[PDB]
From a paper:
Pectin methylesterases (PMEs, EC 3.1.1.11 and CE8) are important enzymes influencing the digestibility of plant cell wall material by cleaving the methoxylated groups attached to pectin and releasing methanol that are then used by methylotrophic methanogens in the rumen. Here, we present the crystal structures of PMEs belonging to the carbohydrate esterase family 8 (CE8) from Butyrivibrio proteoclasticus and [name], determined to a resolution of 2.30 Å. These enzymes, like other PMEs, are right-handed β-helical proteins with a well-defined catalytic site and reaction mechanisms previously defined in insect, plant, and other bacterial pectin methylesterases. The catalytic triad, consisting of an arginine and two aspartic acid residues, is strictly conserved in our [name] and [name] structures and the structural equivalent PMEs discovered via Dali analysis.
The Apo crystal structure of [name] was also determined to a maximum resolution of 2.30 Å with four monomers in the asymmetric unit. The triclinic crystals of [name] revealed continuous electron density of the main chain (283 residues) and a portion of the His-tag (5 residues) with side chain density being discontinuous for several solvent exposed residues. In addition, the solvent-exposed L2 loop (183–202) is far more elongated in [name], while the L1 loop (126–147) is identical in length and orientation. Like other PMEs and [name], an internal core of hydrophobic residues, including Ile4, Ile34, Ile79, Cys109, Tyr152, Phe172, Phe222, and Phe251, are placed at equivalent positions or stacked on neighbouring coils within [name]. These mostly bulky hydrophobic residues with fewer hydrogen bond donors and acceptors include Phe207 for a Tyr, Trp268 for a Met, Phe65 for an Ala, Phe122 for a Tyr, and Arg244 for His. We would expect that, in combination, subsites +4 and +3 in [name] would form a tighter hydrophobic pocket than [name] and D. dadantii. However, large and considerable movements were observed for the solvent exposed loops that connect and extend from the β-strands of the enzyme, such as residues on the L2 loop (186–201), residues 54–60, and residues 268–278 at the C-terminus.
Residue numbers in the entry: -4 to 283
Amino acid sequence: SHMLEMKKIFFSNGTHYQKLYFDEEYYKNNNVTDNSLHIKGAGMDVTTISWSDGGFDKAPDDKGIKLGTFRSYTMFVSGNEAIIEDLTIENTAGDGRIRGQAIALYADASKVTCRRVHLKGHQDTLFMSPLPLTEREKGGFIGPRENSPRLMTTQYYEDCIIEGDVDFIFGGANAVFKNCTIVSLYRAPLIDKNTISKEKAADYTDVPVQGFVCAPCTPEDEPGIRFIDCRFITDRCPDSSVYLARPWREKGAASFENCSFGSHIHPDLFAGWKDIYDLEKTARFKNL
Ligand SMILES: [Cl-]
C-alpha cells in the first residue's frame, strides 16, 4: 500500500546543552503522523544530551511554588514509540539535597526502547510513565502529564548504564532492564555552614541511608519493573548502605533476576517507604 517517512535524529559527537521536549506539538509541527521518535548518537559516551534543571528551582511561570520534579527533565519523550541509542542523557543539577529531584529522561511514550544509553543524575534520574493515581504533596505532579490520564507504558533498556542515588529508577511502567550497569552514587556528608570556625572542624549532616535504586508505583495487575542480568555497583558508597527498592506506592513491583550486587547493597535488599525497616506487605519485591 504506502510508505511513510519516520522521524530519526542523529546527535553528533559532543555535548548538546538543551532541554528536549518531544510532545504532541513537536510531532504536529514536524509532520510526524505516527507520533514516534528515534534518536541516535555517535556512541554511549561520545554523544551527550545535557541540561541542569532541578525540582527546587524557581517556578518558570505562575504554576507551582517551584519548578517541580516533573518539569525537571533534560529530555521528555511521548507518543506511540520512542527509541534511543548510543548516547548519554544527563541532568547535571546535582545533589537532590540541594537542587531537589532532577530527571534526565521523562520516558512517557507507550513503547520505549533504549540501547547502549547512559542516564546520569542523582535523585529521580529516570522516570517511566505513568504517574501514581494521586499526588502525596500539593502540586507534586505539575508537568506535561499532570492532568493527563494515567496511561501504562512498556519499556526495554538494553546494555545501558543508569546512575543515581535516591529513587533513580521510578514510575508505574512495565519495564525491563537487560544487561545494564546500575550505579549507586555516594551521598557525602554535607557541611553545616553555620558551624564554620577558624581553628576547629565544622559539623556535618551524615546520611542514614545512601539510596534506593528503584521506586515503582506499579498498578495492581501489571508486572512492573524487572532487572535481568544487571550489575549493581557504586562509586564509593559504604557497605550495606543502599536498598534495591522501596515502594513509591503500596503495590509497586520490582524483581531482580540473576543480578549481581556489589557490597554496597544491604543484605535485606528492600526498604519500606513509611519505615525503612518495615516493608509494606503489599509490595511485590522479588530476587530470583
Ligand atoms: Cl518495548
